[PDB]
């Protein structure tokens, strides 16, 4: 029985919450708080351990961009610090290949990163890899066919509909087919050999539209839209279904959790988080 973990987020200020949802019984578990509050972070799992990567601590009295990597062990209910990244990365994108964490783009003050780094848990080390062709903050990251895709985001001037792909063996990036919609702060995941891009911000409105990339045809196709428009939403895949958590709709910090069934092409509200928030880190273990 795997759980959907939600770490950090934002409501008035950056949060420390670590909560886990059980889709089987609909229950929420209140787990050990993050040591440092963060929003704009990303979550991932390697060998049953949860990782909270980058982000920013937004407090009423000041902001602190994060280069931190923290590891949560569900068996001990304890957070442990890891080696930090080379640079702080707020609005980061994260992906896992062969038990290695890829930290993609994000921001540090005025800097919009195109840089990409990789973490080796067995050595507790980060190393820079080939940078992206585009500077991307609020980037969605997905792993498919042992390739790392970086989708949408913001380059510092414009919000992007463009997407690119990383080849770990060759250590190089190549541009792929651009999405139908400009999306920054969208939820990006992989389900049944397809990349999904849900919600985000186009420059004028928070989106409820969802589009899917098919590798064989190299095309992006719209699927059923979500019930709620949302930007800076958390996203994950659990037992063949997509789960979207919170985000900002332009008025409210959502507590809404929607579930997408690819067999019926339908979204349904499954639960509510304990409180509304945006910019959470999400993973399943």
């Amino acid at each position: 029985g795997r759980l959907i973990y939600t770490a950090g987020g934002y409501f008035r200020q950056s949060l420390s919450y670590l909560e886990a949802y059980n889709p089987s019984d609909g229950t929420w578990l209140r787990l050990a708080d993050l040591q440092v509050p963060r929003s704009g972070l990303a979550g991932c799992v390697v060998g049953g351990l949860l990782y909270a990567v980058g982000g920013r601590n937004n407090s009423p009295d000041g902001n602190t961009d994060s280069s931190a990597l923290d590891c949560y062990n569900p068996m001990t209910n304890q957070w442990s610090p890891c080696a930090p990244m080379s640079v702080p990365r707020n609005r980061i994108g994260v992906g896992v290949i062969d038990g290695h964490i890829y930290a993609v783009g994000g921001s540090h003050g005025c800097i919009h990163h195109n840089s990409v780094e990789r973490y080796e848990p067995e050595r507790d080390e980060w190393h820079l890899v080939a940078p992206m062709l585009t500077r991307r903050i609020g980037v969605g990251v997905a792993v498919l066919n042992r390739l790392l895709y970086a989708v949408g985001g913001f380059d510092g001037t414009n919000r992007l509909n463009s997407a690119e792909c990383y080849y770990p063996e060759r250590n190089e990036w190549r541009m792929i087919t651009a999405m139908n919609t400009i999306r920054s702060g969208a939820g990006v995941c992989v389900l049944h050999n397809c990349i999904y891009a849900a919600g985000g911000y186009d420059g004028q409105d928070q989106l409820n539209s969802v589009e899917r990339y098919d590798v064989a045809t190299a095309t992006w196709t719209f699927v059923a839209p979500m019930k709620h428009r949302r930007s800076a939403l958390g996203i994950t895949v659990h037992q063949g279904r997509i789960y979207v958590l919170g985000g900002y709709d332009g008025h409210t910090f959502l507590d809404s959790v929607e579930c997408y069934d690819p067999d019926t092409d339908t979204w349904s509200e499954v639960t509510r988080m304990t409180s509304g928030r945006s910019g959470v880190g999400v993973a399943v273990t």
């Binding site: 934002y10 609005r91 702060g185 930007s231 800076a232």
Partner: peptide
């Protein structure tokens, strides 16, 4: 403080 994140 922005439309994308609500910060």
């Amino acid at each position: 403080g922005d439309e994308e994140t609500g910060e």
